[PDB]
Amino acid sequence: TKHYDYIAIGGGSGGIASINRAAMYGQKCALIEAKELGGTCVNVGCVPKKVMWHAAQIREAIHMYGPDYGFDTTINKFNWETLIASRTAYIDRIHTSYENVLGKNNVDVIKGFARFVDAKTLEVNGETITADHILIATGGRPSHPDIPGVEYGIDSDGFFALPALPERVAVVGAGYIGVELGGVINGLGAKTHLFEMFDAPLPSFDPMISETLVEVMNAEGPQLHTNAIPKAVVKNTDGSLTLELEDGRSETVDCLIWAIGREPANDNINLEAAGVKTNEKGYIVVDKYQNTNIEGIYAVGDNTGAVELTPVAVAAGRRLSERLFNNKPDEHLDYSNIPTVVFSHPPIGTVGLTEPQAREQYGDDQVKVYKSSFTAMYTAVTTHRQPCRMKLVCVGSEEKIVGIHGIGFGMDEMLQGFAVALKMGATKKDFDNTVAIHPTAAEEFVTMR
Amino acid sequence: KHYDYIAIGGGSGGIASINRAAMYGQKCALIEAKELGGTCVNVGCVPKKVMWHAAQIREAIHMYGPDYGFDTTINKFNWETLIASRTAYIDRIHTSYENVLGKNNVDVIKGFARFVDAKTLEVNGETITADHILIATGGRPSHPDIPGVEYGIDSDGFFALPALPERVAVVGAGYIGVELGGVINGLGAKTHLFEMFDAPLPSFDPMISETLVEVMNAEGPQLHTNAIPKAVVKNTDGSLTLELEDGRSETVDCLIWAIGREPANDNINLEAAGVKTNEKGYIVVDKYQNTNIEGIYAVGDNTGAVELTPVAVAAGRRLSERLFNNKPDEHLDYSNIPTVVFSHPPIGTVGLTEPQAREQYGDDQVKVYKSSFTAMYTAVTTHRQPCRMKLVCVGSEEKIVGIHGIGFGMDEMLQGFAVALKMGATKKDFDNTVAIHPTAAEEFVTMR
Ligand SMILES: Cc1cc2nc3c(=O)[nH]c(=O)nc-3n(C[C@H](O)[C@H](O)[C@H](O)COP(=O)(O)OP(=O)(O)OC[C@H]3O[C@@H](n4cnc5c(N)ncnc54)[C@H](O)[C@@H]3O)c2cc1C
Numbered sequence: 001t002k003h004y005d006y007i008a009i010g011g012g013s014g015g016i017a018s019i020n021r022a023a024m025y026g027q028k029c030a031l032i033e034a035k036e037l038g039g040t041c042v043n044v045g046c047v048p049k050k051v052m053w054h055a056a057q058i059r060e061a062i063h064m065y066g067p068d069y070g071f072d073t074t075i076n077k078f079n080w081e082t083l084i085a086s087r088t089a090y091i092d093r094i095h096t097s098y099e100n101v102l103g104k105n106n107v108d109v110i111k112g113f114a115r116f117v118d119a120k121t122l123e124v125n126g127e128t129i130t131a132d133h134i135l136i137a138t139g140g141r142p143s144h145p146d147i148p149g150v151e152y153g154i155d156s157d158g159f160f161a162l163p164a165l166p167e168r169v170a171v172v173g174a175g176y177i178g179v180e181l182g183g184v185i186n187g188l189g190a191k192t193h194l195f196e197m198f199d200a201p202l203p204s205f206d207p208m209i210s211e212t213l214v215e216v217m218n219a220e221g222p223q224l225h226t227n228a229i230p231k232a233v234v235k236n237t238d239g240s241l242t243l244e245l246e247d248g249r250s251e252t253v254d255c256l257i258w259a260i261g262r263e264p265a266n267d268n269i270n271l272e273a274a275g276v277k278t279n280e281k282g283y284i285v286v287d288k289y290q291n292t293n294i295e296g297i298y299a300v301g302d303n304t305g306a307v308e309l310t311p312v313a314v315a316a317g318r319r320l321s322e323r324l325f326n327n328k329p330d331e332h333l334d335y336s337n338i339p340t341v342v343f344s345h346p347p348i349g350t351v352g353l354t355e356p357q358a359r360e361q362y363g364d365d366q367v368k369v370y371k372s373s374f375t376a377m378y379t380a381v382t383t384h385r386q387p388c389r390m391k392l393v394c395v396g397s398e399e400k401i402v403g404i405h406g407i408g409f410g411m412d413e414m415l416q417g418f419a420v421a422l423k424m425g426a427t428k429k430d431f432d433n434t435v436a437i438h439p440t441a442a443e444e445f446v447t448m449r
Numbered sequence: 450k451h452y453d454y455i456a457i458g459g460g461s462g463g464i465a466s467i468n469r470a471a472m473y474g475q476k477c478a479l480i481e482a483k484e485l486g487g488t489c490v491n492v493g494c495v496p497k498k499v500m501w502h503a504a505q506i507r508e509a510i511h512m513y514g515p516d517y518g519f520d521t522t523i524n525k526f527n528w529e530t531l532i533a534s535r536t537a538y539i540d541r542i543h544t545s546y547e548n549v550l551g552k553n554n555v556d557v558i559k560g561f562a563r564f565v566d567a568k569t570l571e572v573n574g575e576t577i578t579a580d581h582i583l584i585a586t587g588g589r590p591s592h593p594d595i596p597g598v599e600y601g602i603d604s605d606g607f608f609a610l611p612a613l614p615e616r617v618a619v620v621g622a623g624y625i626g627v628e629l630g631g632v633i634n635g636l637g638a639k640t641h642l643f644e645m646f647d648a649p650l651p652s653f654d655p656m657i658s659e660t661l662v663e664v665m666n667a668e669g670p671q672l673h674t675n676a677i678p679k680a681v682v683k684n685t686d687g688s689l690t691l692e693l694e695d696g697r698s699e700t701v702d703c704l705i706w707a708i709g710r711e712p713a714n715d716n717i718n719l720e721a722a723g724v725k726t727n728e729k730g731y732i733v734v735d736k737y738q739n740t741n742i743e744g745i746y747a748v749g750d751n752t753g754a755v756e757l758t759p760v761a762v763a764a765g766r767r768l769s770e771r772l773f774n775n776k777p778d779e780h781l782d783y784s785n786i787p788t789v790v791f792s793h794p795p796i797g798t799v800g801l802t803e804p805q806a807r808e809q810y811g812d813d814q815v816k817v818y819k820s821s822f823t824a825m826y827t828a829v830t831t832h833r834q835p836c837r838m839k840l841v842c843v844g845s846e847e848k849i850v851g852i853h854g855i856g857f858g859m860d861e862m863l864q865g866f867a868v869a870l871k872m873g874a875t876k877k878d879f880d881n882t883v884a885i886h887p888t889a890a891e892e893f894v895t896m897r
Pocket residue numbers: 009010011012013014015032033034035036038039040041042044045046049112113114115137138139140156177265269300301302303307308309310311313343885886887
């Protein structure tokens with residue numbers, strides 16, 4: 001058997017962040033990945049989605065806004081194969097960068113699917129390896145509905161494997177992934193329909209965000225269908241698929257994408273053998289320091305049920321290696337006020353409490369909301385004017401800012417800075433005392449009246 | 450007629466100060482010779498940004514779209530459509546401005562005002578009088594004193610251009626020169642940029658100058674440093690040949706002076722009010738925007754302070770707070786003002802440059818963090834562009850005194866960081882925040 005100080009199961013965001021930090025303090029480490037390095041983030045998530053988002057932004061420039069700025073252009077050809085080759089080449093160069101860094105840090109990368117032989121032993125490819133500290137960073141995977149014809153839909157992994165852009169696409173589920181892919185496919189030219197079980201897209205976000213998003217979509221696509229509850233998917237005689245809803249609505253398309261949630265990938269690794277406890281949903285239960293109930297086994301990232309975001313798996317994975325191997329016994333991630341950007345059309349940025357949450361937690365007379373609404377300047381000189389709505393949720397006399405939300409051009413790059421100030425306990429007067437930068441969407445948050 | 454407060458100038462400073470004064474029950478009049486909005490709405494920040502968004506759309510089509518798979522033909526670029534669309538936007542902004550002043554009960558008087566004495570103004574033959582008078586007259590383009598200077602235009606002339614010239618020389622590679630040069634180059638003209646010093650943006654942090662030289666060497670405009678024009682010859686065919694002191698020469702169709710601005714404080718008879726000006730013609734003001742004469746104040750570009758719209762607005766609303774809302778110490782802190790240059794790519798900077806930080810605190814005390822990466826949007830193209838960022842820290846606590854960057858995203862990311870900088874953030878504050886992925890911005894909280 002080969003023995004290691006630390007082994008990670010999963011070469012995704014959690015797994016790579018922690019192994020490299022531990023390695024960096026002299027721990028002899030092994031990282032085991034069953035598929036490609038970079039996990040979901042690099043291969044079927046964050047990086048390919050944002051290259052697909054920029055491609056959509058380019059077509060809308062050529063085709064929607066360019067006209068009104070005076071450019072008459074013909075798109076002679078949209079070569080999907082060229083987009084997918086540039087996207088894929090870039091991900092192969094990121095794979096090298098990672099192998100390079102794991103290599104300079106002496107981590108042994110093992111490609112195979114690890115299973116637990118007992119609390120301290122893992123078998124991978126018939127070989128048996130052991131360590132004193134094992135990190136399970138297996139992530140998660142797409143959920144699928146138990147309905148007839150479910151097997152005719154693909155999920156977001158199948159989207160990144162698409163050979164061609166289908167002319168008619170239905171995305172079922174309007175959380176992060178359906179809103180983003182719905183925005184992208186729509187923007188790339190396909191007739192898109194977005195179905196959502198509930199009465200609004202992005203149901204859990206602040207109401208101002210969901211409402212603006214409905215407005216924008218009614219005007220530019222995708223075509224939204226709320227209260228949509230999938231009954232079955234019929235494969236038609238000509239090869240198209242008809243989605244049938246419980247209430248009788250139906251829609252016929254060329255490609256159906258299920259974007260209805262992610263389940264955890266914890267089921268096949270023979271956890272029972274190690275005795276690790278998972279909850280009823282199947283996530284590994286961890287405490288505040290990422291520990292499972294078995295001493296020496298940790299878990300970070302999407303398999304734990306925490307907010308499913310790459311930076312969060314990186315910071316909890318990295319702080320776990322600090323705590324364990326660099327003598328900071330209390331290091332641990334603070335899971336509150338974590339910023340998010342949805343790469344929708346237009347992009348959403350949120351950190352903190354939604355206004356509903358603040359009125360529930362603090363009471364109506366304590367909650368003071370500022371709201372600004374304007375037209376993004378990029379769309380203002382065209383016939384496709386688009387709203388930017390922004391909101392600050394404040395509490396108490398001090399007007400301590402407890403929530404910052406915006407939907408508009410600019411939201412993706414503006415939020416980081418404001419979330420550092422939120423972490424610093426900014427009050428509205430702190431925002432008001434900073435000179436604005438003109439002309440930017442950003443400056444609206446420091447001149448809210 | 451008698452007023453409590455009159456602003457001379459309906460620009461960024463004049464509008465902000467008067468509407469704030471009107472909120473405290475004062476009787477106000479705004480005087481403006483030309484159009485509401487000043488240099489900012491009319492021939493400044495707003496039409497420049499529309500033009501920047503035009504260049505970006507053309508760069509997207511023409512320079513980056515083929516790598517993402519879009520084979521496009523720009524059949525026609527119609528300059529008249531863009532200008533009509535831009536002009537219409539600006540007429541819309543002017544209607545909002547009238548609307549605000551009117552609801553606030555401000556008298557707007559269209560005319561050019563002149564002092565009769567410290568408390569008296571003549572405008573259109575009328576005499577009006579007040580107890581507090583703000584001079585917010587801003588500045589105008591400077592022009593060199595050389596043979597043929599009248600063949601070149603300045604940034605006002607740029608916004609009045611009937612068509613895009615085929616070949617353009619921008620003389621002056623500071624804020625305006627670098628921003629127009631990058632717009633004109635991105636819109637397809639053969640563009641040259643001339644600067645008398647050895648670097649573009651020579652007072653910015655060195656990392657920003659160095660990175661601009663690099664991208665301009667790759668993508669244009671064609672930069673000529675240590676170049677001082679000697680003369681401009683107009684040719685028989687109507688083109689213009691720019692003659693340099695060092696003998697180098699360039700023949701263009703259009704020349705834009707972007708050599709600096711000068712205060713518009715001269716034909717208003719300051720002498721009768723006794724207000725004093727400095728050697729450069731700017732109105733000398735104190736911390737609270739007071740001139741030497743009691744009852745007369747000045748804000749914005751005509752005082753010599755940093756020429757930005759946020760600054761004239763901020764100083765103007767704080768002056769009304771001081772004067773009309775009993776806040777006697779209210780004033781603008783002119784340190785740590787954020788600035789974005791809408792160059793290609795945009796520059797964002799707030800605080801001390803690394804040279805400045807090292808002089809003031811000593812090498813001994815300064816820690817700098819740096820980041821160079823490729824803009825993700827350009828990474829999949831054959832026109833990959835750098836994105837450089839720098840945090841300047843002092844002390845053991847690593848108090849951040851400077852945040853600088855050049856790259857895609859810099860125009861929108863800087864405002865938040867500048868609040869955190871204004872709150873006294875240390876590098877520990879930046880790194881205790883979770884990153885947003887994937888963004889350019891997450892770089893400022895993950896540097897090591
Ligand atoms: C479409 C989509 C878009 C997204 N967009 C964003 C975004 O823009 N911003 C953001 O912050 N987040 C985004 N996310 C979420 C983000 O990608 C994940 O939260 C993040 O990748 C989670 O990291 P992780 O370490 O938990 O696991 P993962 O990155 O999923 O990787 C876990 C690894 O474990 C490996 N593994 C599993 N079992 C074994 C085994 N037994 N042996 C060996 N290897 C094994 C898997 O192959 C996998 O590579 C997106 C996700 C999706 C699906």
